[PDB]
């Protein structure tokens, strides 16, 4: 009986030429049929093989599907067919599969009703709410600002580019906002518009600094703080002037033998009628002085 036998209550298969019951692993029809070592017992549903666990279709057929329903059990099979214990995407979302002793004393691989909680495998952070599926995107658990990658539901935990909108996430994954140090360069991810990588001039640990755009000074990076050795710039609408070092100034200062002023809160050029503890001086609309 070369090829497919009459099952004989054991789903027997034989070699096409050798006519032998090839126990072990065999790729019939491009599949992963495991024939039991006893004689040829083949599929027995559950089948632990060298530690690797496989569930087989009782009605003969094949066992490599993923997202398979078996007597109320939903299990994931990878390309080869080994059972996994991770969080994997079914067409209904990123479902989490847990060991036996997690919840309800289930069987290893059950889609546990894990909701409204965080979870991790190897530092890879996921969160579940309502349905037991990932909510990949921007999330605000307890007022935080987590971001889970839609590709893999894994929370971003570093400098991540989203819609050309680079953000910084800590080791946990929370969106960090303010003055940050990436490698040895200094960046500002301002929280005013929910923590974008800004390229303006904002407060730092040692005074206001110019987070310049690309190639503004040497081959710098976008939003990177640069040394601005006592120069003149005006990005758009507001003039800016710093000290000898890159740090800015917020007080009565002179540049070209012209008296100048900058706001106490922010180091912005004082233009328009602005009375400063006395005479207004008519800070000019342009090149104020």
């Amino acid at each position: 009986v070369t090829g497919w036998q009459t099952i004989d209550s054991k789903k027997y298969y034989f070699n096409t030429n050798t006519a032998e019951a090839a126990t072990g692993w065999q790729t019939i029809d491009g599949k992963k049929y495991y024939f039991n070592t006893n004689t040829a017992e083949a599929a027995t549903g559950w089948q632990t093989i060298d530690g690797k666990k496989y569930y087989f279709n009782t009605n003969t057929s094949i066992a490599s599907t993923g997202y398979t329903i078996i007597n109320g059990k939903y299990f994931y099979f990878n390309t080869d067919g080994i059972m996994q214990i991770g969080v994997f995407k079914v067409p209904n979302g990123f479902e989490y599969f847990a060991p036996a002793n997690t919840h309800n004393n289930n069987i290893e691989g059950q889609a546990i009703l894990y909701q409204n909680k965080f979870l991790t495998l190897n530092g890879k952070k996921y969160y579940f709410g309502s349905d037991s599926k990932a909510i990949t995107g921007w999330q605000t658990i307890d007022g935080k600002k987590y971001y889970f990658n839609p590709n893999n539901a894994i929370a971003a935990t570093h400098l991540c580019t989203i819609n050309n909108d680079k953000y910084y996430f800590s080791y946990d994954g929370i969106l960090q906002n303010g003055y940050i140090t990436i490698e040895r360069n200094n960046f500002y991810f301002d929280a005013n518009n929910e923590s974008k990588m800004v390229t303006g001039v904002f407060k730092g640990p040692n005074g206001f600094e110019y987070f310049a755009p690309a190639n503004t000074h040497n081959n710098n990076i976008e939003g990177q703080a640069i040394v601005y050795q006592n120069k003149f710039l005006t990005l758009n609408g507001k003039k800016y002037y710093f000290d000898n070092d890159s740090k800015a100034v917020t007080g009565w200062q002179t540049i070209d033998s012209k008296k100048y002023y900058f706001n106490l809160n922010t180091a912005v050029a004082v233009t328009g009628w602005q009375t400063i503890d006395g005479e207004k001086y008519y800070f000019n609309l342009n090149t104020a002085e």
Partner: protein, 461 residues
């Protein structure tokens, strides 16, 4: 795994080496160099080998006293900060303490808590330390929101901070969240003294990719009475072998003769480099093999010294280069099963020719599982071979041409058998007894030539 996988492989940024760029990568480096308070300086892997914590500098390995001594994972210090406070393991500051390379440095091998003395060097396979002495210029960036990270690395950093109550505030609050960001190491020249015991020890030379790490680390094995081995790495490291009296030195040159490939942080051996062993420096003071210069300083005057270099030509055949340093000479041995060796002798010979060894004759000294000793010789040219052995008090000799048996005597009736080959010709010298008479003794020297034909070179009556 190749050196630096668990801890980090430094990269040459600008003109300085930096192994870790992120704040949490540095904490992970300390976490990796915090296992020694739980696994010890040496951790057991595969139940067969001892491996040191990766990038943990070890200066002394005293096998005799079962003791270890570490080098200097020394890290710089700070000075400053007014109104310092500690709340929730977080250092709140009024000023900003700054790194200083002009003050005494702070050692992590005083708060890590190494069990240096009385360790278990029972397993006879060991991996050599892959870390020279290091000094760490670390820069504290303004990374925010790391005042919740609780690993073993943060425990080690807190211990270092606690042990130096005035300096090394690893993560602080200079009105902003500040923490370690970079680790820039320089490597002082390091010499590791491994004091060999009277037992047999086997060493694995780590493969360090960064040449600046490799050129600043050296090994020094003080010899004793025993047999010791060493797995040479394809990336050479300076070594100083102290030749003792009547000791056996083995240098596995598997990585030094095979195409090395690095993937997944692991070494894979490929094809043999052509003419890798074509010219071997066999000077009586040092041995340069293909790129590795072993320094032999000590009892280098021993005229009976023999070092051995082992390379696995096949899964079963092993090639052993037996070298005498004082004579600056080398010879080849081709162990393995005699049936398997004869079946594919041509592949072995072409592999040896690819290696570049010019030894025209090879010896054969197999010892199987059931204490059967198959001695013999192989000619590099013409691929002839003689295999003599004993089975059930019977002397069997087999002469193979290439791979076909052209002679076989299953009962060689003669005592004191000794075979040797001149170039391609082979000769067996023995003591036949005439008609099983101990008084009638005839010494013979014979040459086996094809089927049922033996050339009698000499007789003595």
């Amino acid at each position: 795994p190749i050196a630096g996988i668990s801890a980090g492989i430094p990269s040459l940024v600008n003109n300085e080496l930096i192994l870790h760029d992120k704040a949490t990568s540095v904490v992970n480096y300390f976490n990796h160099l915090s296992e020694s308070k739980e696994y010890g300086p040496l951790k057991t892997e595969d139940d067969k080998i001892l491996v040191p914590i990766d990038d943990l500098v070890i200066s002394e390995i005293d096998f005799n006293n079962n003791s270890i001594k570490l080098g200097t994972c020394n890290i710089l210090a700070m000075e400053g900060g007014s109104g310092h406070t500690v709340t929730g393991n977080i250092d709140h500051f009024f000023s900003s303490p700054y790194i200083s390379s002009h003050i005494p440095s702070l050692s992590v091998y005083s708060a890590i808590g190494i069990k240096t003395e009385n360790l278990d060097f029972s397993k006879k396979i060991m991996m050599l330390p892959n870390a020279p002495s290091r000094v760490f210029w670390w820069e504290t960036g303004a990374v925010p929101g790391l005042r919740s990270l609780e690993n073993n690395g943060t425990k080690l950093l807190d211990s270092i901070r606690d042990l130096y109550p005035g300096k090394f505030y690893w993560r602080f609050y200079a009105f902003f969240d500040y923490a370690i960001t970079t680790l820039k190491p320089v490597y002082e020249d390091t010499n590791t003294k491994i004091k060999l015991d009277k037992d047999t020890r086997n060493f694995i030379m780590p493969t360090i990719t960064t040449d600046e790490i490799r050129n600043k680390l050296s090994y020094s094995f003080d010899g004793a009475g025993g047999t010791y081995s060493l797995l040479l790495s394809s990336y050479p490291i300076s070594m100083n072998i102290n030749l003792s009296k009547d000791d056996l030195w083995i240098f596995n040159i598997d990585n030094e003769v095979r195409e090395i490939s690095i993937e997944n942080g692991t070494i894979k051996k490929g094809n043999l480099i052509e003419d890798v062993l074509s010219k071997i420096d066999i000077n009586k003071n040092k041995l340069i093999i293909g790129n590795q210069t072993i320094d032999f300083s000590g009892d280098i005057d021993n005229k009976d010294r023999y070092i051995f270099l082992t390379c696995e030509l096949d899964d079963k055949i092993s090639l052993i280069i037996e070298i005498n340093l004082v004579a600056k000479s080398y010879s080849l041995l081709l162990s393995g099963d005699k049936n398997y060796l004869i079946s594919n002798l041509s592949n072995t010979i072409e592999k040896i020719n690819t290696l570049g060894l010019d030894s025209k004759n090879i010896a054969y000294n197999y010892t199987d599982e059931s204490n059967n000793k198959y001695f013999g010789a192989i000619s590099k040219t013409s691929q002839k071979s003689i295999i003599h052995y004993k089975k059930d008090s019977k002397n069997i000799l087999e002469f193979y041409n290439g791979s076909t048996l052209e002679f076989n005597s299953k009962d060689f009736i003669a005592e004191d058998i000794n075979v040797f080959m001149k170039d391609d010709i082979n000769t067996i010298t023995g003591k036949y007894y005439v008609d099983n008479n101990t008084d009638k003794s005839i010494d013979f020297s014979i040459s086996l030539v094809s089927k049922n034909q033996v050339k009698v070179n000499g007789l003595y009556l």
